[PDB]
Design a protein around this ligand. Structure first.
Ligand SMILES: COc1ccc(Cl)cc1OC(=O)N1CCC[C@H](C(N)=O)C1
Ligand SMILES: [Zn+2]
Length: 139
């Protein structure tokens, strides 16, 4: 679990969005595993606008943060799960690091701000849904 709170927006994994997220829907994209809902309170986070390929992520299944080197956002094949059929997920960045399904939502940050959230993983890999291209999150 986990979310980004920026301005009057809440960014979550689409597969973990709540009834309240869908009732306050701003934008969603199944191919990216992202959903953004509106909030009444002003949010705590800053979005990075950069090309960093290193950063630190939070891993809830270890209660720890880990440094990572990750690939640029790209189209990656993701196996079927209970949430989606087998498909290509876009804007996904992969790195070597521990993750389990419940780690989805953990934030990846660089020195500039929030880069994205955990969205996929397995066998010593962790994948992050990028949010740095969503320029409207800041206006
Ligand atoms: C961090 O996620 C995992 C980590 C390890 C393992 Cl073995 C499996 C993990 O589950 C996943 O990769 N997915 C399940 C939920 C939906 C995801 C998606 N974005 O399509 C894919
Ligand atoms: Zn950066």
């Amino acid at each position: 679990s986990g979310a980004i709170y920026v301005g009057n927006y809440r960014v979550v994994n689409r597969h973990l969005a709540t009834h309240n997220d869908w009732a306050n829907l701003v934008w969603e994209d199944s191919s990216r595993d992202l959903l953004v809902s509106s909030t009444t309170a002003q949010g705590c986070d800053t979005i990075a606008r950069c090309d960093c390929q290193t950063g630190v992520y939070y891993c809830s299944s270890r209660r720890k943060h880990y440094p990572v080197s990750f690939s640029k956002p790209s189209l990656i094949f993701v196996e079927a799960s209970e949430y989606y059929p087998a498909r290509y997920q876009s804007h996904l960045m992969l790195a070597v690091g521990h993750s389990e399904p419940g780690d989805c939502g953990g934030i990846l940050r660089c020195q500039h701000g929030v880069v994205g959230i955990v969205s996929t993983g397995g066998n010593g890999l962790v994948g992050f849904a990028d949010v740095r291209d969503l320029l409207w999150l800041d206006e």
